[PDB]
Amino acid sequence: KQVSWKLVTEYAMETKCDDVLLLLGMYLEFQYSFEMCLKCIKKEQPSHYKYHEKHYANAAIFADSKNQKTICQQAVDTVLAKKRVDSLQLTREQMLTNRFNDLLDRMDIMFGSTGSADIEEWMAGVAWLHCLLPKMDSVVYDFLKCMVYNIPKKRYWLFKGPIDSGKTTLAAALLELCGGKALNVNLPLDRLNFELGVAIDQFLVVFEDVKGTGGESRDLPSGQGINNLDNLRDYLDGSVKVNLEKKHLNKRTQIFPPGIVTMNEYSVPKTLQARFVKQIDFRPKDYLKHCLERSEFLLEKRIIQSGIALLLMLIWYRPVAEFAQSIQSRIVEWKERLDKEFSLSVYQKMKFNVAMGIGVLD
Amino acid sequence: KQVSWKLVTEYAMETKCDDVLLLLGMYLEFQYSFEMCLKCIKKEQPSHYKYHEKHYANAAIFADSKNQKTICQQAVDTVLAKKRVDSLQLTREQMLTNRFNDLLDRMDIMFGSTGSADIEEWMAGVAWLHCLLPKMDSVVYDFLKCMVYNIPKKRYWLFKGPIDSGKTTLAAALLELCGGKALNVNLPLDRLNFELGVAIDQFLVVFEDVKGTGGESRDLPSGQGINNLDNLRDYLDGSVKVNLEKKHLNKRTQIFPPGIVTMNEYSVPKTLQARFVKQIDFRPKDYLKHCLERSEFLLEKRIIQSGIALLLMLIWYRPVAEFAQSIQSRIVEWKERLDKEFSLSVYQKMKFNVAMGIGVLD
Amino acid sequence: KQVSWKLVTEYAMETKCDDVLLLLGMYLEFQYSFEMCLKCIKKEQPSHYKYHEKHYANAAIFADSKNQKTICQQAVDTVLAKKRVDSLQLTREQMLTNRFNDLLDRMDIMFGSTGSADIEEWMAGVAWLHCLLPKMDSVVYDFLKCMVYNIPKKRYWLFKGPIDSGKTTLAAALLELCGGKALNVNLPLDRLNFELGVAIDQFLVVFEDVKGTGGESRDLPSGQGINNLDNLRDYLDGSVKVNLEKKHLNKRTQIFPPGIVTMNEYSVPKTLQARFVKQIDFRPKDYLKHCLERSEFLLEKRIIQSGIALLLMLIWYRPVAEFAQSIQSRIVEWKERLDKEFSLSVYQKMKFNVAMGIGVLD
Amino acid sequence: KQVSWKLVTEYAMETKCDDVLLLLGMYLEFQYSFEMCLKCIKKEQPSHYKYHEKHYANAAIFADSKNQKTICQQAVDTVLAKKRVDSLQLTREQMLTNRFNDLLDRMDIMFGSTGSADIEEWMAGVAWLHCLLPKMDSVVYDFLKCMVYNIPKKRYWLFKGPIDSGKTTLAAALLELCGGKALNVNLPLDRLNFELGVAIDQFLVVFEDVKGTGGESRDLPSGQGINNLDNLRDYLDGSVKVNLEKKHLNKRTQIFPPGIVTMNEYSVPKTLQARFVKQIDFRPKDYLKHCLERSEFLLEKRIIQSGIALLLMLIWYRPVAEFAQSIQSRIVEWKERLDKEFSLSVYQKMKFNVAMGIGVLD
Amino acid sequence: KQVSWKLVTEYAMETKCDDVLLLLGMYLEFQYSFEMCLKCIKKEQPSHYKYHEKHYANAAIFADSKNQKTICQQAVDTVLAKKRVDSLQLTREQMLTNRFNDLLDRMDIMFGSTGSADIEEWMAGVAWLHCLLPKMDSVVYDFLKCMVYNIPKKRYWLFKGPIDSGKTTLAAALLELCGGKALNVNLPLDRLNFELGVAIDQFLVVFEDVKGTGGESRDLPSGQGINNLDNLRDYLDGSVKVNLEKKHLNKRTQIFPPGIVTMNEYSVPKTLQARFVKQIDFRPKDYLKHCLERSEFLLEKRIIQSGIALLLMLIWYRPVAEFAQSIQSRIVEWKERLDKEFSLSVYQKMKFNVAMGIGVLD
DNA sequence: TTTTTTTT
Numbered sequence A, B, C, D, E: 001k002q003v004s005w006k007l008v009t010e011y012a013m014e015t016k017c018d019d020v021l022l023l024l025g026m027y028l029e030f031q032y033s034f035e036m037c038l039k040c041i042k043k044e045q046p047s048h049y050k051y052h053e054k055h056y057a058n059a060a061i062f063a064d065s066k067n068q069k070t071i072c073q074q075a076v077d078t079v080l081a082k083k084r085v086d087s088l089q090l091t092r093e094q095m096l097t098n099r100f101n102d103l104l105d106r107m108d109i110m111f112g113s114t115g116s117a118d119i120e121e122w123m124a125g126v127a128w129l130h131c132l133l134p135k136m137d138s139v140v141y142d143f144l145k146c147m148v149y150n151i152p153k154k155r156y157w158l159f160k161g162p163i164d165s166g167k168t169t170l171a172a173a174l175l176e177l178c179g180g181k182a183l184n185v186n187l188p189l190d191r192l193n194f195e196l197g198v199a200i201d202q203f204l205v206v207f208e209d210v211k212g213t214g215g216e217s218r219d220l221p222s223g224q225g226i227n228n229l230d231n232l233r234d235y236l237d238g239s240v241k242v243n244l245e246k247k248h249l250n251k252r253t254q255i256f257p258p259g260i261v262t263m264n265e266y267s268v269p270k271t272l273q274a275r276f277v278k279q280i281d282f283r284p285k286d287y288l289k290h291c292l293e294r295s296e297f298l299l300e301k302r303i304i305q306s307g308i309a310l311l312l313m314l315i316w317y318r319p320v321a322e323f324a325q326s327i328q329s330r331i332v333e334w335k336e337r338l339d340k341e342f343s344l345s346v347y348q349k350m351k352f353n354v355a356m357g358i359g360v361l362d
Numbered sequence F: 001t002t003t004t005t006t007t008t
Ligand SMILES: Nc1ncnc2c1ncn2[C@@H]1O[C@H](COP(=O)(O)OP(=O)(O)OP(=O)(O)O)[C@@H](O)[C@H]1O
Pocket: A132, A161, A162, A163, A164, A165, A166, A167, A168, A169, A170, A209, A262, A263, A264, A282, A283, A284, A285, A286, A287, A288, A289, A290, A292
């Protein structure tokens, strides 16, 4: 009687483990007599206790195998192969369907029975978040499906404002739901070569503020960014594929991803302006700044720029129709909790505390 | 009859040995009869004498095998896989509890009949060390707290200060009390990414004299440290779960460990300079030199460099409630063994000698 | 019949061979009949003729093997493993005690029946060296004890003097005595990574003729030495462990070995002068050169720069008690040989010749 | 039936072949029926026709093997293993003796019944060489002794002169005589790593036309050679082992070989000038040019570059006593052959023609 | 039954294929029944249709092997081995003779019954090349002898003249005839190191279009190349061996190939002028230009660039005894074919048309 | 896969 390689591969698929050492370590834990398994008794980790009783007999024989890392290497390949099949064939819409569950599962880290951050802090985050912008949740949903459709030309939004205006931090929170990356163009022309190549294969992207020759009217440092950007037409418009670069490594050729430009109050030509769909003009705001200062557990528990907190803001405001259809079951499961655990009045109180610019939990 | 790879892997687990050459060398010692073994008789190394009598039979058969390095690879994999499981599943508290358990076990030897450490010399070390910064039994606890909570930008501290300011001496004991690694980035990083592979699965990492450029304005020779740092403005705050590279080996998506940057006082970029619990600094205290000039065990046995000395300091001062919850029996057991033979007066007899640069033993 | 991998492994341990090609080459010689092995009959190499007759039978079957490199690989691994086990367990006292036993075995052969050395010439070397500085032998004892204790940030010595003032000559002899390696600091600060990677497991290091800057006043062309040394201050301090470099291999972590540095009289940052415990300043002296001119065989046989010369000096000048207990037996026996073989008047005559600048013999 | 790997290893040893491809290619030729082997019948290559008949039967079975490159890999390694054994155990005199035996074997072929060489032409070459410098044969003897003795800080000879003064010609013949490598060190600092790597296990090295910077007053184009080389001070002196690097390999460590430096007429730092034991000026001379102009079969056949020419010069001029003891017998054979085939007057007539600038032969 | 690895190795030797994937792909084609193989029926590729029927059965079994790439690697190694044997053993005359046989075999196809070429158009090509220079066929014959003898200093030829006067056309045809590589010395001095690596094991090299300096006086753009060539005397004189380098390979040493230098009419340092055996001046000629306008099939089929055209020129003009002994039989047969298909009157009528600058054909 | 090459 012998190790079933098949059962190891099932576990690797079900865990979605794709690191050989990690698979090896965890599967060896099943070798002890399941019936007393104290990790099961404690209900520590589901990726153990949901599986040990099934996998036990095979794990005993696994521990006696002389070949262990070879079994695990094949199992890890099966998981990576699955990703690469899907990476080819799936739509941006279905890929966002990951991004939802990619966070709807992380919600349980705080709000499952471990409770390891109080959900009400995230509601206070959701309050502070929704106070940050006019129509904030619609402005989210606008930007969201704007990225899903990836419509050529009609792609890029400009986050203008003063310094310390929350724009990049909002973009960072927004990026949390989907990933993506920020990038620089104030660099000299040669540095752009590899710099632009950084963007390769990101689902969404951002730019850092420019340094732009006219900005020092405000003393906004008058670097190359503006003039550089006005040359870089086609990447933005996304009409056609373009080539991209890596140090010591070969070029790649793809349609350039969609994204956001952060900027401060530089002057601009009509040409570069016309590239954009839309401009936003952020500012720091009197209640909302002092609110966080009075409410810093939101900063402390990393809530303020969490896509989980965007996601809860979404589940709050947006109707079930707005969500990836089969996931709606999980959305309503969250709506059910959210609307039961929280009265409107706590949400009212929280948001109104932000309207007093004061501690959002009170 | 056959080599048991199982019995080998037990020894690797129980020694926590994680080098294939060390492991191989170690096990081959057992091939002689423990019944006669001079090392067993001499009680020189526990990693031998605890085990020789058990493994002798298996080691004899291991000694004939033709696969010897392969057995040791699989055993080392098992030990490293165990670490990787703990890496992700444990709370930061349990990690420190593990670490302290090991220091405690070693101290049980040190001041056991065999370990031949003078606890008064060690406590003279404790006296000297608390004089290195009179705050430190608090500030150490503040550091430990902040590390366990792992809070962004509070994830880092600065140790500015010139030579012979002690910033090394403290970082040394602290990086022993914790698990962790030193690191450097003095150079343009285009090929240098694999150095951050050392940050994989670390509780803590530390930087020292990561050079500024332009510090030659104040006689600190220029180097690319600050320039790399204030580009990668993330990892003092702690945001991207970078996929850490390793030579010929798998690579590890994680947020970078928390830490400290230590330096002889270069000029520093402003956006970087924010990213700490404390921008804080170390100033030479000649009387501490005067003490060690008069207090020589403390360097000769490296006592003042040791996490062991910090642990002794914490046992002495801190209330048991401040410790991790579960281990506290061992904490009182040692508090007893300290208070049994240290009065405050004798501890002060050490302490104020240091404070006035007098020799500690008296 | 079948290869005894065990007998091969014995020979590698016996010889301390650790190059697989050298091991292979050596073992193959044993395929021919020791019974007429001309090397044995010439008694030319001990690592051959001591072993040939024992290993002959196994080597005949090894000569047919298809695995040969694999058998040698495992044998070399066993020798390497023993070295790492020793690095992690021996006191530096024992390490040096073992090193002395190896050199004393070489001296047995050199002055044995094959005896190809002449003890008169070697002791002429001792007289020349002992004349090179006042109280020479006491300075060697200081250096050795310093390297044995390895007390941190008090563990490097620096030699200064013009060219051909003999500082390199002395350093070479010391390095053979302890075992260790030379390395070059006069490089771009970048280059040092796989340079210092050689210091792994070494007992001692030496850095040569370090180019300061501004010495061209003194006709000394400026360079990188002072830069790279005054960078690597922690390596001098020895307070903390470092990670070290090797190709196609993971890093290894350890404290850096103590050592010696040499210079022509460049500029000195006193940040380094604080770290050197000691300096010794060398001057060229004509009579030593005139002696050498008339005494070519010293250089031609490399005597004055061999650590075997230093060992003879110490055996001459030091009490038996200064040596570790086990070798005191051998030390006594070498004092016996010396006293039998030299009258004191002979040594006095030789040192008198050295002083006069005649050739040492007459 | 099976391949005899032993016979392949024999063939590799007996041909000293150490390229796996060349070994393979050679060995495969034997598979055809020896009795018709046209290469044998035409006696074109000795490393074929000596061995084909012996190896034939095993070559046929080797031709069927599925494993051919593995078999060759084992054979090549034993040839390499022998070289390393010898590198650590022969005297420098014995090495030169072995090298001489090899050239003498080649001379037996060149001036055989087979073999193209006209001994009168090669002896004409010797006349031109002995004319190039005063006491040419004594100069060669002095250099050979210096290379055998390898005395530290007295190891390197400097050739300088105008262009077309003879320097690389003479270096070529010396290098062919002793064996060794040429190196170019006018390079940038980085590639020197692998460049100096070439010296591993070599007997001599030669540095080609090292450029000074400056001195373009002499119409000498500038370059880094001299300034670069003065950093390598240690490598010339050869007082201590140095660590050396090849691509994709971990460092070797050995004493850096002795050798020759050639340059056009730059000026040199005293630090470097002091390290040359000897300097030879080369001066263009009109009659050598007009002689060579009339005698160009010397150039066409490369006679004056060849170490065979220098060896013939030594056999003509030097006493039998000066050769190492075992070669003295073959030296007497060749001296006899030479005297039998040339009177002194014929040789003196050649020298006389060269001094006239007339064509050598008459 | 089993795959014959021998039949594959024969096919590789037969086709001289030394690319594993090309070897692999072609062998697989044979697995279908040659009897209906349309590539056979079309007689489309000689590498296929000559061999399919013979290898059919082995290809069928090969198609089921699980070891396919292993078989191919051993086969390809055999072809590489043969080349390296020949590189060391053959004379330069045999090399050229082998090369000529290859071209003659392609001509037998090109002008065969299957032959897609027209021998009349290729003869028209020969007429145009014969007009490019005076005594063209004598010039070619001189060049080849100069290459075969490879006599030191007398090794290199210079082509110069205005742009569009055919120099690179002739270079390309000669390079095809002998085989070799083009090189670009106009680089800066660093990567020039890897550039020359291309010359390894080549029979012949071409230095394309060496840019001078100060020719801007006559509208020539300045560049590095000439200065780089003055830095390479020995590579051209070919008197002594030199080191050569490739990416990811350790250096090799050989005599650098003979070759051709080409330039527009910059001025040439007399240092460099001395390298060259011969200089050939190209002049633009209008009647060639007008002829090319009319006989475009020359350019369109790339006739005038091809070494096959030069070989036809040699066959048509040169006496049989000038060719290497073995191929004289084939040469006689091709002369006979050419004498059959063309009267001298026809050929001279072609030459007359070119001299008129009218189209070649009437 | 690194290391070397690329990158600087
Ligand atoms: N309206 C606001 N209310 C509260 N805090 C705010 C507000 N605007 C900005 N801040 C604070 O400003 C800090 C910086 O925000 P962020 O980096 O996103 O700004 P930015 O405008 O993109 O920056 P900059 O353009 O200066 O680089 C954050 O801590 C954020 O909370």
